[PDB]
Amino acid sequence: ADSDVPNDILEEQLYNSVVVADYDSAVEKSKHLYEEKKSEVITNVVNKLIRNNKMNCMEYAYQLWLQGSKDIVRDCFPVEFRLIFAENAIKLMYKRDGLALTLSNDVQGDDGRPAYGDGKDKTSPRVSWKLIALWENNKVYFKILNTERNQYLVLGVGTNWNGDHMAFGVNSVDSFRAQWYLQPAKYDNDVLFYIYNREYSKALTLSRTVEPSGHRMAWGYNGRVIGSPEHYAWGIKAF
Numbered sequence: 001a002d003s004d005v006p007n008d009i010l011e012e013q014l015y016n017s018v019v020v021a022d023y024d025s026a027v028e029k030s031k032h033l034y035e036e037k038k039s040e041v042i043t044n045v046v047n048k049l050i051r052n053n054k055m056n057c058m059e060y061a062y063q064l065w066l067q068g069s070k071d072i073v074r075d076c077f078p079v080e081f082r083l084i085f086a087e088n089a090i091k092l093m094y095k096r097d098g099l100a101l102t103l104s105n106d107v108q109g110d111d112g113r114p115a116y117g118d119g120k121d122k123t124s125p126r127v128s129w130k131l132i133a134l135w136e137n138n139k140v141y142f143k144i145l146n147t148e149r150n151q152y153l154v155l156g157v158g159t160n161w162n163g164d165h166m167a168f169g170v171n172s173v174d175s176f177r178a179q180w181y182l183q184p185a186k187y188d189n190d191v192l193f194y195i196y197n198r199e200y201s202k203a204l205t206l207s208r209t210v211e212p213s214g215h216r217m218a219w220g221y222n223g224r225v226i227g228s229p230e231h232y233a234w235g236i237k238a239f
Contacts, residue, residue, distance in 0.1 A: 002036050010038065014045045018056045021138060023063040030064060034072050042076040050078075050184040050191055053226060058182050061085060062133055062140045078191040080236045084182075089128045089147060089239035094206050095192055096231050099216065100127040103146045103169040112151055112170040117206040119214025128239040129153075134179070141179040141198055153204075154178045155197045155220040163222035165200060175199065185229040192233035194225055205232055 002010060010033065017026040033041045049057035064072050065085040073081050083090050092101040099117030103126065107113055121127060130145040144153040151169030154177045159165055170178070176199035183194040195204040202220035210216055225232035 167218040
């Protein structure tokens with residue numbers, strides 16, 4: 001009888017449940033709350049996780065999605081979380097510039113197609129991406145597939161003077177350089193995500209330098225990103 005527990009208390013223990021990464025328990029309490037009509041408990045927990053930039057939010061959503069609770073992700077989480085986990089075509093839009101992430105037309109080096117924010121285009125099939133979930137080591141990571149080119153996003157192994165790594169599309173996952181993790185954030189009314197490389201733990205960002213073409217190169221950033229989602233974070237929209 002969850003009716004007999006204050007709502008504030010129900011929020012807290014689900015939230016604690018997620019933050020300590022106890023996912024069977026969070027999924028179990030969630031299935032029960034939803035059942036008894038208490039969905040706002042869940043929605044409040046989700047908003048708290050997003051505001052506090054809680055990485056465990058992603059594991060939470062993904063577990064809900066795998067464990068027969070697609071209904072919960074759909075109802076208590078912003079539409080982004082359904083696009084991620086249903087693996088729908090998305091666009092990745094960099095909050096600071098409003099630029100859409102894409103791969104270059106021309107294959108440069110073994111490196112594959114340099115990635116960058118497109119100075120103009122937010123509509124062509126070049127800008128469509130898929131995020132493909134995997135569970136390992138009690139965490140959730142994603143491969144980021146560019147759908148037109150069928151190439152995966154990665155951080156090159158070399159650095160520039162500042163320790164930043166270029167981002168490219170390549171044909172092959174051999175390594176953690178092709179896998180990423182997400183941290184949710186709230187800006188204005190947006191749900192935004194910091195997007196981190198699994199090998200280097202650096203955030204995917206767009207350079208401040210505009211190319212002669214109007215494009216800005218995509219890098220893994222050597223420096224602090226958190227606390228600045230309008231500079232470092234990505235919004236996710238349906239393609």
